[PDB]
Amino acid sequence: GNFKSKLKKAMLSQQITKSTIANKMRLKVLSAREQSLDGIFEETKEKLSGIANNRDEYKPILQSLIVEALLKLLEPKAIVKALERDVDLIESMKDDIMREYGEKAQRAPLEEIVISNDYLNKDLVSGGVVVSNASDKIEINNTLEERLKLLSEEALPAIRLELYG
Amino acid sequence: YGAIYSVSGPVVIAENMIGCAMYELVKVGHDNLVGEVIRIDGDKATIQVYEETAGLTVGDPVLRTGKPLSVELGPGLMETIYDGIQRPLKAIKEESQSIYIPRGIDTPALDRTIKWQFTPGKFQVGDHISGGDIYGSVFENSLISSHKILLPPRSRGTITWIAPAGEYTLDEKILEVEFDGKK
Amino acid sequence: YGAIYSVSGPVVIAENMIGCAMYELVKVGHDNLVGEVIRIDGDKATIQVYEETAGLTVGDPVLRTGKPLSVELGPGLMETIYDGIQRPLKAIKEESQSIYIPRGIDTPALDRTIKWQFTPGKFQVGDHISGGDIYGSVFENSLISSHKILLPPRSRGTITWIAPAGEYTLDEKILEVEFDGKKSDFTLYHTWPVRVPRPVTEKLSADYPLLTGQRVLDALFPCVQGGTTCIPGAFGCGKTVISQSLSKYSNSDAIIYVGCGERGNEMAEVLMEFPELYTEMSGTKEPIMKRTTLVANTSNMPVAAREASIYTGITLAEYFRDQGKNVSMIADSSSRWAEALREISGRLGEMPADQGFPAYLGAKLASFYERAGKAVALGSPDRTGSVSIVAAVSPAGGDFSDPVTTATLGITQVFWGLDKKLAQRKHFPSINTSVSYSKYTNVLNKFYDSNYPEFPVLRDRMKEILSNAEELEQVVQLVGKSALSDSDKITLDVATLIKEDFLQQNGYSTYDAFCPIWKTFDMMRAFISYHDEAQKAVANGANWSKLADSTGDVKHAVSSSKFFEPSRGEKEVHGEFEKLLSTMQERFAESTD
Amino acid sequence: VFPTRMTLGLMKTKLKGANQGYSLLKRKSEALTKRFRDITKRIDD
Amino acid sequence: EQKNAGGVGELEKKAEAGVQGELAEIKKIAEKKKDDVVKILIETVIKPS
Amino acid sequence: NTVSGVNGPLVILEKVKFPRYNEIVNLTLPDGTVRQGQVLEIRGDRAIVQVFEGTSGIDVKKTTVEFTGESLRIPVSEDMLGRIFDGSGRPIDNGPKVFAEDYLDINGSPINPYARIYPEEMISTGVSAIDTMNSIARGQKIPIFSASGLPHNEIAAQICRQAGLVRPTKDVHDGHEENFSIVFAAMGVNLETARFFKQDFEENGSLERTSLFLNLANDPTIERIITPRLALTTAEYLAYQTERHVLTILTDMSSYADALREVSAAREEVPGRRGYPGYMYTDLSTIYERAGRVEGRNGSITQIPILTMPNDDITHPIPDLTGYITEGQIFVDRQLHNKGIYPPINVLPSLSRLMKSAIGEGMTRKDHGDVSNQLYAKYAIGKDAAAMKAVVGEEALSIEDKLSLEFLEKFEKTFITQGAYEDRTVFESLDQAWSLLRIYPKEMLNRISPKILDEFY
Amino acid sequence: NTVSGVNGPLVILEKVKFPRYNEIVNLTLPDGTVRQGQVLEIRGDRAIVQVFEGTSGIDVKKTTVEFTGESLRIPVSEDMLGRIFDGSGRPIDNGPKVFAEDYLDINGSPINPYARIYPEEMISTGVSAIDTMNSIARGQKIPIFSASGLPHNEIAAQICRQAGLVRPTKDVHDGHEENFSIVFAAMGVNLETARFFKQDFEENGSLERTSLFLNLANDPTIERIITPRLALTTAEYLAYQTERHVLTILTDMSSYADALREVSAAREEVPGRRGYPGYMYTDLSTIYERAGRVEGRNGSITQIPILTMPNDDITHPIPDLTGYITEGQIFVDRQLHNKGIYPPINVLPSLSRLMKSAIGEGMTRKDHGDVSNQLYAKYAIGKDAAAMKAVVGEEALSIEDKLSLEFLEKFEKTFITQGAYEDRTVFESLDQAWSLLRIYPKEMLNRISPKILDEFY
């Protein structure tokens, strides 16, 4: 009776090691996959800083980030938070950002760009901008880090299939 | 046509209706989900939308089909599997590569690439015609002519154009009726 | 700040409540009533005010304090009775001269004069610390000095200051924690939101049986520490007697007694009875009281308090759980809490859709339940603490088809019946195997196998005797008796014995103050042995009547078992029952031939 | 007149009591009349 | 039971060796195709998303 | 200020934002009479009031309000006994108003100095079927559940007549030592029966000891609900200040329940299950709150609420909720009444769950709780045996059951039956219990420990 | 960025109308706690949001909102398995990232490719009572209607855990050439129960054959209904693209139904009978649409939903609607659990309506169908015999009834009863059946062709 019972018991403990082998294999494989993914993304943001810190190359990129946000804002004044070197950059192409929104939307040119006195850290993001409503009802968070994070959702299947599919 | 004001649960409410009747079939948003107008309060219409509205937004167009929820009775009705609003299941199985019809995908109520050989009935140019009279027939069975083409009810007049025997598309015309100008 | 918009019942609405949340502690009116913003409708906030209105006018200010409504858990919780909003009832008796809470009168959540002996933790200066780690301990009673002072759930940092051993107040700071800049200074009391489940190191599956002290509760389906239980009531079947009786008889390190929305007489009874009676843990100088922290709400007090009751109560079990104390929480009755919920549903004007009962009702019942269970105590030194929730369920309309019961059975894994017909006949608590289940059973009988007993074998046979009796009784009622098999008669007879000795017991068993597992097993073991010998005896040939007449002496002896108390054999194993088995065997010998 | 709010539960069990009785009692009746017939022919002879 | 007194610790020999080569092919093809996947991520982020 | 509107009997005042909550306002109507109303709710630039006298007469622009500035409170005297009042405490006999020595709140939420000592000493109502089975303790509130098809008003009456004649029986028992006083509140009860209540007090000689508040159905709904609150508050003053044993008899709860129900038909507050308010429980609980031993623990207030089931079932909202707040119940039944029994009391669903603990041997006996337990089990079997007896025949009967059938009738017609004027000793009650039990052997007993039995049987 | 209000679970956020339906939104708190929710309704400058974690405690000005731009979909993958998830599909294992290969809708349909070809080919659960007597072939949806009086979770686990150990045995007989996967969905669950399922699987070595999704009962109701929806979508992808036969175990449909009844508290949508929706049909259907043969048809998605009667009422709205849609039902009764039989499936009213349609050979035998008829009919007769025995006695009973009795006890105690860790393959079950039936002669066996009957008695 007990031979058979203690025997069933250890045959069950035997398949818990199969289950720990199968879980530990699959945990290692997958955690090596995650580590590669965070080196693809890590390299994206080391290149992005490199682009952002060269201001003249960056100038069109900044314009289109703000303009992308304005198409989803659709308010008559927009409040823009930028980096220290990028509030000056915006200022000197105020005319080109509101021009370019009026030619790329139906909505009539933004009447004002409000240059913020609250600034973003290099400690949070690599750059980019926070475009928000005037009364601060809605924010289109169009920062470089926020954008890469959002990108990751759609890029993840593309990359998973190419590498490991 | 209309613009969506609100979407609350499965129900979509849409403003700028100056001509939605309360039996009308409408395609709501850009996803073209099937919907039909239950109630109208003011310029706002109440539509129950029967097909999943996840993806649907407010400010999106509401385009009328221009007629109520109806079925098309045409030829090619035999050896087909349909839905109750009538859309060929069979054509979706081939095309979508999915047995059932998923959200946002729609097809005409019968196949429309099909052509049929129409033979005339007992009418001729300039003769008076009435509802239920046999204007021609189509075979579908080798036992019977399943689709007798009848003049539409709510239609009568004098026939300005009779097409002869020959093969025609469903889209293509064969009859014109004059009944207070071209009917 | 806010200006009162409308006062409808004890519900106050106030406009101009911005930068406010939905659990905020607020002072309501010019009367400064304690209150909480349950919900908000735009600018207009709907606030449940926990003291009554009788003279609060519109347009008086509403001042938000800048933090949620929480409860205070510190030292001195034991040997004192509080309410469900948790203001000391006792302090209220002297100062206001009103035994129960007076209107417009406010008193803070714990006593602010009481001094406690602080002894240092296992931390020193410059040490990294975390939540539920033991920063000290306070000698709180004489039975227990097990009251560990912890760093709160959701706190970490480095301890800037450790004060040395000595006498302090519980307002007099002894600890500074620095996380990123000064986190706050700490004291002996700590605050916890009554709307959140208290953090835990991990939850662990229940596998350690608590003995209820009631032979019947252990016998059919054993209780576990860490579990969930329903006990049916009916509000006139002595449900109170068994609740209070269980509380005394069950043995845990701390016990929390939560009167949800009670008679006021019943609550009064427990307050009186417990220092008069003794513990089985050798408690002295108000024995039981020293072990209990008591939450007292009557139904006649405000409905807000009574909402708040269960939540405060669960947080108290949970606080002690993190210290590594095993807790029995007896909450009585959960149906009265639901009746308070139906009240809130109609006073705010929220939709009821649970059979004329709240929208939220099914989920709130589950949320309370999930906070109970067995766990590895909060903080890293690793202890075992547990909470077993015994929640009484009773009618709120129908017999079991009321919302409350339907929801509770879904979520409970232990259910112990109580039949009304047997209650009126005096045979309570009556556990019916059809109206009872335990899902913990399989891990529990294997636990008792390790402990010594053959327990799993006895369970199956106990079930079989009760089970066939119900079906044979239905043939008896309709057809009658003119015949009923030799075997079938035996089952009926023995099932009567089980009723009388086990199921009936509540001031009828002279020993019942705590009954060991071994003794229960030994008693049931005699019943089952009598059964198998008897059925074999009719089949190998011997009349049913000769068999009754010869068993004779032993049959009475098992009938009388219930009065007997451990006094022979061991301290848990009883010789009269061991003697009984062998004599039984001799009776069978006389009876077959 | 009988209770309106959740009588359903008791009243269902009344039906189950009744039902069990028809089948069982009919089996019992069936068997007694089957015997009765056997005796009839014996007694007559 | 002696093969259950040897069957533990043997879990990790088989868990490591069993993916010893999978974990090398994961890091190998990642360094290769890294700039070419990064360059696609770069375009999406720096032009409207 | 002035009436904006009236919605149902509820009157919608439009007014400026100043009043107290539950503040009395006086409405000046053009007809030579001014009336008082209480703000039921105060809201944003309007208040909804139900006016305490009448229900008609309010006008749009011909009304004036002036705020009294004081919320309703009951002015209390302990000299209020020996006076006849209505539902507002106004005199009907001209002359005896409530008057005051102190002013106390109508809700009794400010004082609430209810003792944390559980019902203690014995109380009887002189009816054997009550006393023995569901034994009354001071401060215990146990409901009288009745049904219509009954002389349910006669049962209430009987208890009112009997209350205070019991008290010398109790002095002797040493479950009373101090004065007994009656506080009597009437809600929606017939004219004839109101004269029966006055007459029962008169006979007893306790007219001086009692206060009568009389409220009919042609007096408003809001005013009906206030009446027991006035009564209750006065009882609390009697119990607390002068350490008296106060019995308030509060009839009819059903009338009280309807009144609550008629309102909320224009309140924002919405009605729950079976159209009853969900805070009906809350309303019952305010009434019920003044009941229990007072602090001084030489006084108490014992409360007897009278409920007639209007539908007859016990799962109807009115009884179902009450039974929960109280500790047990007492069932009167139609069936006994039909045979020709008085007072017809069925005991089978009747149980009081705090009965054993209160009582002890010093004013009862130790067997009082055991002898009661035996009589329920035997009565229960007798009742099932009767039902089976009809259907199948005498085929399902057994020896115990035949004995139980006789027991049922024996008990019903000797034990429960007694005259209106009759009153009963508890010790007497217990010898009659034993007597009925003498027809069964002792081996068949089991709800009594064999020690106890041997002494008294 | 400005919370307007909270009315129960339903949260009103006031921000513009530019979001779409079921777009995830983020409530940013000054507590540093980001909670995601999904918009239920969008209206002009407000949306109504149900937050997955919590539902209250958000400030009305110290909060901001951000819109994700993505409607809720499940990242689905074949490397996702063998891992423990929450009710949103997010690891609690402490494992790596979810991983994606596709993003599939969980709204009710991903691509809906449910065939117009009817069930054949046996799927084995490893429980004798279900497999032989009620044959389930793939694509069929047969529920287990159980009760709270049974241990519903433990039986559910048993079906999973013994399932997929049937499969090497099937591969040899050549029933399955492709693999077997289990998707297990647990709802509103108790903590002990969540852990229990993982431990059972670990023991059998079925862990990496299955994915377990646990939603706990302290987690809000909206998450709970989302849980099976996530599970069902994952399964449709494994079944279509890599062709596998999948058995989906969904417990508890009663908790899902409650959630649906529960949401509505500011909606203008009214429920039907017993408080449960009029549209309760619609919601059931939703789970039901993902179940059937997939396109290509060697893979399938096979569904067994588990429904717990809370009060043993088969006229309770939940089972009735379901029962009409489903292809038969399995009834599990309290009575057998009480005798101590485990599992306690009484096969007395249980039915599979496409019983013949499932069996064949190579995973069944030919003789399967005939036997199913002998055992059901004999068993029913066995129950009837037990009642008759009690009456007549043992020494006055019939031969035919005596046989039927003997069968009842063996049938229960051998066929239905099996151990916790004992797998019952269909081939194994059929042999045990012939031993039981042997006791009857060939003369009393006749719903069996003489061909079979001669092979095996």
From Swiss-Prot, chain A:
Keywords: Acetylation, Coiled coil, Hydrogen ion transport, Ion transport, Membrane, Transport, Vacuole
Effect of D86G: In VMA4-1; is rapidly degraded at 37 degrees Celsius
Name under which the protein is recorded: V-type proton ATPase subunit E
Bilayer disposition of the protein: Peripheral membrane protein
Record's function text: Subunit of the V1 complex of vacuolar(H+)-ATPase (V-ATPase), a multisubunit enzyme composed of a peripheral complex (V1) that hydrolyzes ATP and a membrane integral complex (V0) that translocates protons. V-ATPase is responsible for acidifying and maintaining the pH of intracellular compartments.
Alphabetized GO MF terms: proton-transporting ATPase activity, rotational mechanism
Subunit and partners: Homodimer. V-ATPase is a heteromultimeric enzyme composed of a peripheral catalytic V1 complex (components A to H) attached to an integral membrane V0 proton pore complex (components: a, c, c', c'', d, e, f and VOA1). Interacts with VMA5; the interaction is direct. Interacts with VMA10; the interaction is direct. Interacts with RAV1 and RAV2 components of the RAVE complex, which are essential for the stability and assembly of V-ATPase.
Location in or out of the cell: Vacuole membrane
Miscellaneous field: Present with 16134 molecules/cell in log phase SD medium.
Lineage of producing organism: Eukaryota, Fungi, Dikarya, Ascomycota, Saccharomycotina
Main location, first listed in the record: membrane
GO biological process, one term: endosomal lumen acidification
Family listed: Belongs to the V-ATPase E subunit family.
Acetylation found in the keyword field: yes
From Swiss-Prot, chain B:
Modified residues (Phosphothreonine): T107
Transmembrane segments: none
Protein name: V-type proton ATPase catalytic subunit A, 1st part
Species this chain originates from: Saccharomyces cerevisiae (strain ATCC 204508 / S288c)
Lineage, opening ranks: Eukaryota, Fungi, Dikarya, Ascomycota, Saccharomycotina
Gene: VMA1
Residues of the full protein shown: 25 to 207 of 1071
Curated annotation (Swiss-Prot), chain D:
Source organism, top-level taxon: Eukaryota
Subcellular location(s) per record: Vacuole membrane
Coiled-coil zones: none
Homology family: Belongs to the V-ATPase D subunit family.
Other remarks on this protein: Present with 8500 molecules/cell in log phase SD medium.
Annotated function: Subunit of the V1 complex of vacuolar(H+)-ATPase (V-ATPase), a multisubunit enzyme composed of a peripheral complex (V1) that hydrolyzes ATP and a membrane integral complex (V0) that translocates protons. V-ATPase is responsible for acidifying and maintaining the pH of intracellular compartments.
Assembly information from the UniProt record: V-ATPase is a heteromultimeric enzyme composed of a peripheral catalytic V1 complex (components A to H) attached to an integral membrane V0 proton pore complex (components: a, c, c', c'', d, e, f and VOA1). Interacts with RAV1 and RAV2 components of the RAVE complex, which are essential for the stability and assembly of V-ATPase.
Protein name: V-type proton ATPase subunit D
Species this protein is from: Saccharomyces cerevisiae (strain ATCC 204508 / S288c) (Baker's yeast)
Name of encoding gene: VMA8
Curated annotation (Swiss-Prot), chain E:
Signal peptide, first to last residue: none
Compartments (UniProt record): Vacuole membrane
Complexes and interactors: V-ATPase is a heteromultimeric enzyme composed of a peripheral catalytic V1 complex (components A to H) attached to an integral membrane V0 proton pore complex (components: a, c, c', c'', d, e, f and VOA1).
Family: Belongs to the V-ATPase G subunit family.
Note: Present with 2280 molecules/cell in log phase SD medium.
Biological role stated in the UniProt entry: Subunit of the V1 complex of vacuolar(H+)-ATPase (V-ATPase), a multisubunit enzyme composed of a peripheral complex (V1) that hydrolyzes ATP and a membrane integral complex (V0) that translocates protons. V-ATPase is responsible for acidifying and maintaining the pH of intracellular compartments.
Identification of the protein by name: V-type proton ATPase subunit G
Organism: Saccharomyces cerevisiae (strain ATCC 204508 / S288c)
Gene (UniProt): VMA10
Covered residues, full protein: 58 to 106 of 114
